[PDB]
Design a protein around this ligand. Structure first.
Ligand SMILES: Cc1cn([C@H]2C[C@H](O)[C@@H](COP(=O)(O)O)O2)c(=O)[nH]c1=O
Ligand SMILES: Cc1cn([C@H]2C[C@H](O)[C@@H](COP(=O)(O)O)O2)c(=O)[nH]c1=O
Ligand SMILES: [Mn+2]
Ligand SMILES: [Mn+2]
Length: 174
């Protein structure tokens, strides 16, 4: 199993641990088996209990009010782990999302091990950079390169981004 994943957050830090003090507000993950999308995905919006930074809002457009009635990371953590366990996670700039995931897992105080100890982690951005050195390798740049539709991506979304990356990664490794 390959799980193409993405997350949206309240923001990030430019110095020090990028996730410190921030929270995941959306998790989007899509399953790929034998190079085919299975359709069995994972998608949740989470209540951060903190405000979304303006810069972050400018990217995903997810309002603070929309998250008030959502589950907390603690409430979705078990099913989330059941879903990703043992798979190869494919993430564009993996260190970003993995950092946030392990951070949130650690706050649960359940002795949950690091994600890369129970999941294989593949950074699709590193893969793209290796294949296309000296070129633009953002997800949008890769969409144009592989003729993938990203017209509905004015604002970024975790599931939306994961789905697009899945198509891009399948083409990049096809
Ligand atoms: C592109 C970008 C993302 N982010 C944070 C908030 C987003 O929810 C999260 C998602 O990045 P993404 O395009 O890698 O899915 O990263 C910023 O804080 N500023 C930015 O300029
Ligand atoms: C570690 C890190 C993560 N990120 C997050 C926010 C970006 O939108 C996302 C990557 O977007 P991109 O691979 O589509 O250009 O990852 C950065 O932008 N810069 C960084 O240095
Ligand atoms: Mn992302
Ligand atoms: Mn995203």
């Amino acid at each position: 199993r390959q799980i193409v994943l993405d997350t949206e957050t309240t923001g990030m830090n430019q110095i020090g641990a990028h996730y410190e003090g921030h929270k995941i507000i959306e998790i989007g993950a899509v399953e790929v088996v034998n190079r085919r999308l299975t359709g069995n995905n994972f998608h949740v919006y989470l209540k951060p209990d903190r405000l979304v930074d303006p810069e972050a809002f400018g990217v995903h457009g997810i309002a603070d009010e929309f998250l008030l009635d959502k589950p907390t990371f603690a409430e979705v953590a078990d099913e989330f782990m059941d879903y990703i366990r043992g798979a190869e996670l494919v993430i564009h700039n993996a260190a970003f999302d993995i950092g946030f995931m392990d951070y949130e897992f650690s706050l649960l105080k359940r002795d949950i091990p690091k994600t890369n100890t129970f999941c294989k982690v593949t950074d699709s951005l590193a893969v793209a950079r290796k294949m296309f050195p000296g070129k633009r390798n953002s997800l949008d740049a890769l969409c144009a390169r592989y003729e993938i539709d990203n017209s509905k991506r004015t604002l970024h979304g975790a599931l939306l981004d994961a789905q697009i990356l899945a198509e891009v990664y399948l083409a990049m490794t096809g």
